[PDB]
Amino acid sequence: AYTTFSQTKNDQLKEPMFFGQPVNVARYDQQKYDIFEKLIEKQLSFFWRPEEVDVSRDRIDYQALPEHEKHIFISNLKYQTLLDSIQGRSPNVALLPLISIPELETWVETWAFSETIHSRSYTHIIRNIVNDPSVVFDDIVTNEQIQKRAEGISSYYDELIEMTSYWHLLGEGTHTVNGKTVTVSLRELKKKLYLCLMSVNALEAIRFYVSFACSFAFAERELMEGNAKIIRLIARDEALHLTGTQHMLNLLRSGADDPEMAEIAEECKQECYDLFVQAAQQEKDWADYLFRDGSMIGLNKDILCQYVEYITNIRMQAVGLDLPFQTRSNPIPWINTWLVSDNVQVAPQ
Amino acid sequence: AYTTFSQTKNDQLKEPMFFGQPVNVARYDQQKYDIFEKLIEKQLSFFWRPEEVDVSRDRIDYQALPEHEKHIFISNLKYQTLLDSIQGRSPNVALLPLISIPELETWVETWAFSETIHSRSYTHIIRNIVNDPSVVFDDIVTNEQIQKRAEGISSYYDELIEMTSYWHLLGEGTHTVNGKTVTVSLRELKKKLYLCLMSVNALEAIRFYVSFACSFAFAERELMEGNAKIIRLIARDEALHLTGTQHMLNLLRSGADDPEMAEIAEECKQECYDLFVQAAQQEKDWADYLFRDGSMIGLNKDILCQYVEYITNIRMQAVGLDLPFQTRSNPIPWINTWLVSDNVQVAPQ
To answer: Which residue is catalytic, options B122, B157, B194, B209?
Structure first.
């Protein structure tokens, strides 16, 4: 029962964020939550094109890098390309059919579009520093380590999409499909979304920031500086993105938007904690992979894992989860000069 | 069986446009069809924000308009807002889950995003010329004439989305759902898409151009000039949009992309003709509604209907359909100065 234009004249101010009447008229003179209108407007204001950054000198730097330093940089780049390949399509495919307020609908399309620009920027970087880009792009799919992350991250989306399709097609209740029993539950779907949104929050607020440290560490060494200029632009967008999902999640668990969602958020509050911890660990294990053949000046497995814990604690408090790690100070304060914008707070506070 | 990251390492150059393996890695170093990469790049180059246009003086003009001229202008604006409310979400929701090549995937997200900007521009216009924008936005849903168009146009999308969800969930074959028989057929789904793409082509290549004439006719009278500056930007984007669907449709019917699709395009070739003719007629009937209380200098029911036939013939030849109307010359050549861009051919040739 998805409609690209619902015929009911509803008061969009009183709709929930999710699972209400599909948005008919796209209007921007009013909001239920003006955060999403402010995110649109900011993200629009940030619009950049990857080609406006000269990455020419990165090719020289990269070729001059020792093999293990190549491995660090290209593993990082590959991982980023994976993540935003997923982030390019998924918010549109997974969330659009569920949104019921216009400001959130357009933020999600704006969000996803800004990701395609990131992915296009990753191509721009890759095709400028390596001879055969196909080797790089193919490894993104077949790399053992990258694949593990791809599968877990994508499952949260996939399961939400499939349960959505059942919901739209069948409606709520217990059903008979080809001799099997399919039970469609709005409550479970609401949970599937919450977990997905928690997963996507960890992805952008934690996983990408672990990657930002890696990129900016080269730039600190005065290497791969074109790449770093792009990551600076990418980081500024990312601060918007995670801000969006922090509000979605916080508005959902408060019960202000949907009293049901409040009780559902408490029910899987443990599960969300476990989700974030597993992501933190996975990025620690990723650090292991990056530096398996050696480290470089200013960044190693130990320093990076410290940063993972530091940033993971901050992000989780933001969404009301218990902190899983020792209260620590910033192991790499030098990252803050890179993680900065005068229009949005990029660096974690 | 939709996956936000398919684990198979496929050769994206050999995939079909639609119904192949979902795109995993978003890469832009190569294409199967470089038209879509050129559309992305052009559309990116056109990026504009509605607020960069001062519509201040339109409020004075509008209030000074006679009641029937208000009716003409606001009916037109309302209709545009409807159409791109649909075009904001629908290409993402309907097409994304079916695309199997990266350049087409990102064009569709870029396309849809550019529409949200149009919708945001329509708000910018509306909130500047009327006192109570809610009256306007509500009428978009409840207006008898507008509603008829909304329902037909949205059904092509909706039916494609629902048949997609069955396909992903159930796969091809004859199924049992709650005691009913559901037959999922790829061939029918391929047809549903083709018809939808034909409908969306008529929407942007014909229906919006009928609306562009109306807007620019005010600007010819030196009225509602802020609005016209925005429509000029909107028209330039639209020329890209219809170009995209012309290639999709032409690549589909040639059989170069999918030999099946060739035979399917011929099978419903009549049906497509009927679809376009019905749209042409509907816009003629719309002209009747616009000018029911009188016309203005330089534009009336007769002139506008002439333009409908003129533009409808051109668009249909572009997608290989028979012409339904007398071969006529341009009834309003003055529109061409408005319908122009040095970077893309906006005016129909």
So the answer is: B122
